[PDB]
Amino acid sequence: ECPLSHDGYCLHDGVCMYIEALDKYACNCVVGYIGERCQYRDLKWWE
Amino acid sequence: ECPLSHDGYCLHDGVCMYIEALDKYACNCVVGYIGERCQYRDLKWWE
Amino acid sequence: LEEKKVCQGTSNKLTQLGTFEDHFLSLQRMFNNCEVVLGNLEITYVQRNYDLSFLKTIQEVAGYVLIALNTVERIPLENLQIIRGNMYYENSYALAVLSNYDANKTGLKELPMRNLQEILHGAVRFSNNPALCNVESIQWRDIVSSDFLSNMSMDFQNHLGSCQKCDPSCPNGSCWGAGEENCQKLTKIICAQQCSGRCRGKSPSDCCHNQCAAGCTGPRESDCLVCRKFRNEATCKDTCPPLMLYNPTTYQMDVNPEGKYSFGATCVKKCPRNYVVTDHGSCVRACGADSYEMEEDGVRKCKKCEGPCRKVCNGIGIGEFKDSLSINATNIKHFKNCTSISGDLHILPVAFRGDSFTHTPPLDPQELDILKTVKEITGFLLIQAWPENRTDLHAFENLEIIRGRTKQHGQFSLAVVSLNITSLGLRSLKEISDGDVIISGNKNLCYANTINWKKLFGTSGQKTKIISNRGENSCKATGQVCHALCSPEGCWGPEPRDCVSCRNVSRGRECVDKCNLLEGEPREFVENSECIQCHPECLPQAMNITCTGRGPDNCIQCAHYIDGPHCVKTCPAGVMGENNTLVWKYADAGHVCHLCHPNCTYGCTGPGLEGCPT
Amino acid sequence: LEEKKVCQGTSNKLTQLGTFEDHFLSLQRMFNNCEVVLGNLEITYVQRNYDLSFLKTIQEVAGYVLIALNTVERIPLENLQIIRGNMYYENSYALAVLSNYDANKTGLKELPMRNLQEILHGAVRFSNNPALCNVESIQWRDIVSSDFLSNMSMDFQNHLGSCQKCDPSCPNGSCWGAGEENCQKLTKIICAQQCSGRCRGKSPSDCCHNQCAAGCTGPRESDCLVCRKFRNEATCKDTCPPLMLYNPTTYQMDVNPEGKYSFGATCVKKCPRNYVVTDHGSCVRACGADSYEMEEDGVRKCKKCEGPCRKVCNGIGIGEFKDSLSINATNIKHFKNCTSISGDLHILPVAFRGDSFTHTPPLDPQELDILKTVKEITGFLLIQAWPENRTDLHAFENLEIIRGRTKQHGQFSLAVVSLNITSLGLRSLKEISDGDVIISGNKNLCYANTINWKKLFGTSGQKTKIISNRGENSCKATGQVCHALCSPEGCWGPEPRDCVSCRNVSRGRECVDKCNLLEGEPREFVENSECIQCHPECLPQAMNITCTGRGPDNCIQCAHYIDGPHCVKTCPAGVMGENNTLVWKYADAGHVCHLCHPNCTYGCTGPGLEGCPT
């Protein structure tokens, strides 16, 4: 999807996805991690 | 004019006065001295 | 409404937090029962036939409002009154509705923001909402400030056109949708020349105070809907009332009986216990580089630096460290001689493996000893990774305070999650002045429960979340319960030097059972539940007490020279006393040296005056 | 826009200054062309036929207004808008009109204060004016504030019938006289319920700003007739804009682009040069009780002290010496050891002949030496008397600065008038930061028109007024000129220690013709035109010079022995060294000092052991 210029952009095993409408690149965090690039653990929910 | 406690009230040779209209004591300063007890020289006019 | 229920607001610009139903719950848990969003309000990826009826309670967003990529019909933001715009989206916008259509061209239809009357900073952007209708008719000149009326980017297209026109009692036909209340309420452009700020009617007797933001119900500053800058517990102020007032008649400052300290957007009577107080009377987080913080009389002031005042290093996420998000190998060098971190500390798993997207080499694990000089953190400490061969948090060994001025999620100030460490190892931590503690998910971590974290806290209302670590029955099953030579106060490890307190007595840092008063090593004396050695000039005895204090005023055995009220190995041979001469002291058989006449100032190795020769 | 002309105003309540025409000349000479009286306005003892038309310009008074004992028919104060009331007559009144009749019960008739609209603080007292017209009809509710409506004392009794009715055009007959120009303009009691202060109409669209004092000509803050507390560039402020603004988002303080220093009742760009600058952004006159005035960093500042700050006395007219008018024989003790008068200094003829009215004994001339430690006056210095036996201002020899913050009559900061001294003798005076200088009337002093005063004047617009002292050639004929050892710069007296600068060189505090090079008793050297003695260990050179510095290092040849670079009297014999080892030396051939043998403890008279027979 997103090019190799964005390898490792999404942390904690997130998958990088392309938004063709807004012409931007965003992450799809796994359950439990928040932040613009999945960098933070969600502390106040499920340890 | 004014009683015994007010002798030496007016400095620089002024004369004390009694004002029967208001029941007060005031000084009749000499020319050149200002202030309530004629204590100050008039430095702004003529030495 | 004595206090408005606040929420922190998300910061995920376009990130999707899992599946479409996992994202909706995070949106639903974040903003449920909220009235003031302290951050940003992002409504993204809300699918069709989802209930957004929990949004009708919000009244003020302190950041931006992003509404993008939804396919839901009606987003009911009816009570939203103001967008303070403390943070722009794309450096420009404090409100942005972008591309709310699915593949079938269907999507957003109803955005009934009837009470939106003010946007303190920033512009507005609308684009690619091919189903949204009854919104281009709004006159955005009343809302967006005239400074930003040029940055606005508003283009509407509704080729479908499946909705009705605006109620007749609408100003110039401008409505927020169908309905009579859905008409737009104008309070800025319709009014006379007297009213500088907002207003209520066309009559010049309807001008609001210049501190009301949306509108007003009266002419006083105590009748504003929302405040523009500050809030003096009932009234909207421009600046908080000063503590000292000037006197144009005596040219001196006088105490103000109604002086308040400014703390954020509120004027308070006293700063929080863990904040700095300036002389202006303002609660700050860390005062200027020309000064240095210092405790004084229970409160925390800061005095001017004298030449080289100590180093106070910045924290992650502040100052020159806003781009960064961890102690990446690039910035670890800037933390060399820091005894306090004015800010936070984020140690994330992307530090030890290196980030390509920011060009940071993988951090070397041993490079963490640089942090063994840090002694306090004014923000928070967040540890998500740590070397795998370690057992404890070795780099943070002299840490003593975590003031928790700024916290994580606005809640936690100490977070140690998912670590392979065995023991905590923070055997210097004496205070956690604010914020909760979470120490959870550590695969094998004992001892984390023996500490009573109530003793560390400084404010009431701080919880702990120590959950799912090594089992407390599986800790003692392998002996991983700390020493019995320690008090029942806790332990950060198995060694006697890791206990919070001891059962008998301490020796410097390690706790022992007795201060060897009789035998063994150089004997000492107990005081204040410690062990302190008396100077080795104090001749030891192996029968009973050997000394009482540090100096020689209270020893029992003195093999050295007992020079009267004291002891010494060798009595003085000319120490600077009086007479501007070398004050001598001749030799004695009872070790008590005495002074001889100025004649024998050579060595006067004889007693008396005539008895010192050459 | 241009400033309004100010005048100082009188402060002699019922005192008459000479005859009835000597008095009227002083009143005219003071309030001519004035527009803002900074002090009080006192109109007393004005007789009939006198033209008081110079009072038509005054527009506001900052003290009180007293009109008493007149017999003139009309006092035309028909532009006065405000009496600020910063000082009361009889402890309660900011306007008192008392006993304005002659013997025939016919006195003041027309007081057409048709523009008087507000009295900031204070009450009003009218009594015993038997010929006053058209003032009992005034409504004083619109003028004096409601806090003081109870302290007012209005007694009106004309009841002769020499008055005319009020032009039937104003509410309730309230008139200031006859005519359609001369009746009360109500601006406070006719206000609508929502007007916060004064109002120029009954409609709710006519309220003035909250800072307009008298009235307004608009709704804004730049439409006030006169400001109420402070005065910005052209607007009326409540407080001067702070130098630094609090940031409720970042919890820090940012610089204000238009922060002004509060100076008096105005906001300025920067404090005057001689005023103290606090950190609140306010120009003051004295540092706080816990602070001392810190050195000039280009400007004055206040620094906090540790323990006792210092000994600094309050001058006359301030603090505990608020009502004392001289340096009594009773208060002189309190100036015992202070080196900085934090105020003024008056020395009047009362101090020396005592005052029975205030029960003060006569001052002792020998006690005036208590002031010899003073080194800085922050106000002015007024010496009207001096002990006749003394021929010099001996108590003020160590005086160095006169700050001139408070001046006499608001103009003069050093005044020496009508004394018997022969010379001024302020031999260490260096600066006069503000205010004029008058030294005139001293029939003997003539060592006074030689100084270049423009050197001492710290600012511009300062002048010196030195007239009718002595001759200017009658003491140049009897030889009372300065010593030829003084530069043409000036001279404070006849001694050579009484010159501004020296001709050739100087021996400390005295000028000389040449340093003691080659000959003399003490050998000396020259640097910056000063003569410093050579170290005693420098051999008296009868040929060339002796030394090139103070230390024994610069001697041409020593007087005794020579221990290396230094010239010593006797080679060291007991000086502390390294490793606690003593030091013993000896003098060889060229009187050079060399160390003893380490073993030689009792010193040595020669190299190595053969040298010390121990």
Author numbering:
A (entry chain C), B (entry chain D): 5 to 51
C (entry chain A), D (entry chain B): 1 to 614
Provide the publication's sentences verbatim.
The epidermal growth factor receptor (EGFR) is a receptor tyrosine kinase that couples the binding of extracellular ligands, such as EGF and transforming growth factor-α (TGF-α), to the initiation of intracellular signaling pathways. The extracellular module of EGFR consists of four domains, denoted Domains I, II, III, and IV. Domain II, which bridges the ligand-binding domains, contains the ‘dimerization arm’, a loop that mediates the principal interaction with the other subunit in an activated dimer. Domains I, II, and III form a compact unit that we refer to as the ligand-binding ‘head’, and Domain IV forms a rigid and elongated ‘leg’ that connects the ligand-binding head to the single transmembrane helix.
To better understand the origin of this apparent structural heterogeneity, we used 3D classification to further partition the entire dataset of 765,883 particles into 10 subclasses. The resulting structures for different subclasses differ from one another in the extent of a ‘scissor-like’ rotation between the two ligand-binding heads of the dimeric extracellular module. When the rotational angle between the two heads is at its largest value (~25o), the two legs adopt similar conformations, and the membrane-proximal tips of the two legs are juxtaposed, with a separation of ~5 Å between the Cαatoms of the last residue in the legs (Thr 614) (the ‘juxtaposed’ conformation). When the transmembrane helices are in the N-terminal dimer configuration, this linker favors a connection to the tips-separated conformation of the extracellular module, and when the transmembrane helices are in the C-terminal dimer configuration, a connection to the tips-juxtaposed conformation of the extracellular module is indicated. For the tips-juxtaposed conformation, the reconstructions for the EGFR:EGF and EGFR:TGF-α complexes are similar, with near-symmetrical densities for the Domain IV legs in both complexes. The only noticeable difference is that the cryo-EM density at the very end of the Domain IV legs in the EGFR:TGF-α complex is slightly weaker than the corresponding density in the EGFR:EGF complex. Cryo-EM densities for the Domain IV legs in the juxtaposed conformation is similarly defined in all three complexes (EGFR(WT):TGF-α, EGFR(WT):EGF, and EGFR(L834R):EGF).
